[PDB]
Design an enzyme around this catalytic site. Structure first.
Site, PDB file in Angstrom:
ATOM      1  N   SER A   1      -1.821  -7.740   0.473  1.00  0.00           N
ATOM      2  CA  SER A   1      -0.798  -7.447  -0.517  1.00  0.00           C
ATOM      3  C   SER A   1       0.357  -8.476  -0.577  1.00  0.00           C
ATOM      4  CB  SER A   1      -0.140  -6.056  -0.303  1.00  0.00           C
ATOM      5  OG  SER A   1      -1.099  -5.086  -0.743  1.00  0.00           O
TER       6      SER A   1
ATOM      7  N   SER B   1       2.971  -1.395  -4.475  1.00  0.00           N
ATOM      8  CA  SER B   1       1.861  -2.262  -4.086  1.00  0.00           C
ATOM      9  C   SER B   1       0.562  -1.857  -4.799  1.00  0.00           C
ATOM     10  CB  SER B   1       1.701  -2.274  -2.565  1.00  0.00           C
ATOM     11  OG  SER B   1       1.248  -3.552  -2.154  1.00  0.00           O
TER      12      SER B   1
ATOM     13  N   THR C   1       5.092  -6.088   2.514  1.00  0.00           N
ATOM     14  CA  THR C   1       4.089  -5.705   3.498  1.00  0.00           C
ATOM     15  C   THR C   1       2.679  -6.019   2.987  1.00  0.00           C
ATOM     16  OG1 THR C   1       4.230  -3.483   2.562  1.00  0.00           O
ATOM     17  CG2 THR C   1       5.420  -3.864   4.632  1.00  0.00           C
TER      18      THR C   1
ATOM     19  N   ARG D   1       3.912  -3.198  12.170  1.00  0.00           N
ATOM     20  CA  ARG D   1       4.144  -4.432  11.424  1.00  0.00           C
ATOM     21  C   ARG D   1       5.598  -4.577  10.992  1.00  0.00           C
ATOM     22  NH1 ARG D   1       1.362  -2.795   5.554  1.00  0.00           N
ATOM     23  NH2 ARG D   1       2.723  -0.964   5.295  1.00  0.00           N
TER      24      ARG D   1
HETATM   25  C1  LIG Z   1      -1.925  -4.616   0.264  1.00  0.00           C
HETATM   26  O1  LIG Z   1      -2.037  -5.123   1.350  1.00  0.00           O
HETATM   27  N1  LIG Z   1      -2.665  -3.429  -0.095  1.00  0.00           N
HETATM   28  C2  LIG Z   1      -2.164  -2.471  -1.167  1.00  0.00           C
HETATM   29  C3  LIG Z   1      -1.322  -1.389  -0.514  1.00  0.00           C
HETATM   30  N2  LIG Z   1      -0.226  -2.108   0.166  1.00  0.00           N
HETATM   31  O2  LIG Z   1       0.625  -1.159   0.720  1.00  0.00           O
HETATM   32  S1  LIG Z   1       1.337  -1.906   2.024  1.00  0.00           S
HETATM   33  O3  LIG Z   1       1.974  -3.192   1.601  1.00  0.00           O
HETATM   34  O4  LIG Z   1       2.296  -0.894   2.622  1.00  0.00           O
HETATM   35  O5  LIG Z   1       0.297  -2.394   3.007  1.00  0.00           O
HETATM   36  C4  LIG Z   1      -2.107  -0.629   0.498  1.00  0.00           C
HETATM   37  C5  LIG Z   1      -2.782  -1.491   1.520  1.00  0.00           C
HETATM   38  C6  LIG Z   1      -3.477  -2.749   0.959  1.00  0.00           C
HETATM   39  C7  LIG Z   1      -4.800  -2.496   0.244  1.00  0.00           C
HETATM   40  N3  LIG Z   1      -5.517  -1.241   0.442  1.00  0.00           N
HETATM   41  O6  LIG Z   1      -5.219  -3.321  -0.473  1.00  0.00           O
HETATM   42 BR   LIG Z   2       5.044   0.188   7.572  1.00  0.00          BR
HETATM   43 BR   LIG Z   3      -2.811  -6.888  -4.270  1.00  0.00          BR
END
Ligand SMILES: *C(=O)N1C[C@H](NOS(=O)(=O)O)CC[C@H]1C(N)=O
Ligand SMILES: [Br-]
Ligand SMILES: [Br-]
Ligand SMILES: [Br-]
Ligand code: NA
Length: 246
Positions: free
Chosen positions: A49, A97, A188, A232
């Site tokens: 992400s 995200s 994140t 993290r």
């Molecule tokens: C990014 O890493 N993704 C989308 C979403 N991000 O939320 S996070 O930044 O708190 O990790 C969920 C995890 C991940 C994915 N499933 O692609």
């Molecule tokens: Br977190």
């Molecule tokens: Br993404």
């Protein structure tokens, strides 16, 4: 990057949780960085992400994202996380995200323009193979913590090969804490739990503006169990608190 110095005392926050990971922290005025693990600082991992940062800039640059007020409408069909099942602004899509929003951005950017801008940005190994809508999720793109802090410093300085206005738009979309003399931009990421003998990666990257100082940071760790994910943020937060930043 300028100088980087290994500080093994930062490993205390990692071993306490049996985490294999790296933190890179750079204070801008001194052009120097510190890390717990020099070797891992330069190792490259799936962006997951955190790729929303370059992807958003490129979407704006190419006109795929019309302007900072574009609304990404939900078609009402199931999405993998309930928090994504709604209309979202650009900042909203980054903050919650919403993968599908950014997958469609990438499709509309297309392979040629995506390759062009990752080369311009010196973004990781610049390998977009694996499908235009997933190369940063499960394809061949890889980036190190060192490279993240270089890229984020360029964004902070409006020095990426993109318009200043587009860099500024994405920067406000990344604000995650705002106080009179304390401002945090961050993102994140979580690639998943990996497979046997091949862990996934979790990220936290960003920068802290405190008074007239600025600190760029990038954290990643191996992860094979989602219950470990909050580390993290907590491991780097403890380190930055020990440095008097937080
Ligand atoms: C990014 O890493 N993704 C989308 C979403 N991000 O939320 S996070 O930044 O708190 O990790 C969920 C995890 C991940 C994915 N499933 O692609
Ligand atoms: Br977190
Ligand atoms: Br993404
Ligand atoms: Br989805
Ligand atoms: Na990886």
């Amino acid at each position: 990057m300028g100088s980087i110095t290994e500080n093994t005392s930062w490993n205390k926050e990692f071993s306490a949780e049996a985490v294999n990971g790296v933190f890179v922290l750079c204070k801008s005025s001194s052009k120097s960085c510190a890390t717990n693990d020099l070797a891992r600082a330069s190792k490259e991992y799936l962006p997951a992400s955190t790729f929303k940062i370059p992807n958003a800039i490129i979407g704006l640059e190419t006109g795929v994202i019309k302007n900072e007020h574009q609304v990404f409408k939900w078609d009402g069909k199931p999405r993998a996380m309930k928090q994504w099942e709604r209309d979202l602004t650009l900042r909203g899509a980054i903050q919650v995200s919403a993968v599908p929003v950014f997958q469609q951005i990438a499709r509309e950017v297309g392979e040629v323009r995506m390759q062009k801008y990752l080369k311009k940005f010196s973004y990781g190994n610049q390998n977009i193979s694996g499908g235009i809508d997933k190369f940063w999720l499960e394809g061949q793109l890889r980036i190190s913590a060192v490279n993240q802090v270089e890229f984020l410093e360029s964004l902070y300085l409006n020095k990426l090969s993109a318009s200043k206005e587009n860099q500024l738009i994405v920067k406000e979309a990344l604000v995650t804490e705002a106080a009179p003399e304390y401002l945090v931009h961050s993102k994140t990421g979580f690639s998943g739990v990996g497979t046997e003998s091949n862990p996934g990666v979790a990220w936290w990257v960003g920068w802290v503006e405190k008074e007239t100082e600025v600190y760029f940071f990038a954290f990643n760790m191996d992860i094979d169990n989602e219950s470990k994910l909050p580390l993290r943020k907590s491991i780097p937060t403890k380190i930055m608190e020990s440095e008097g930043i937080i």
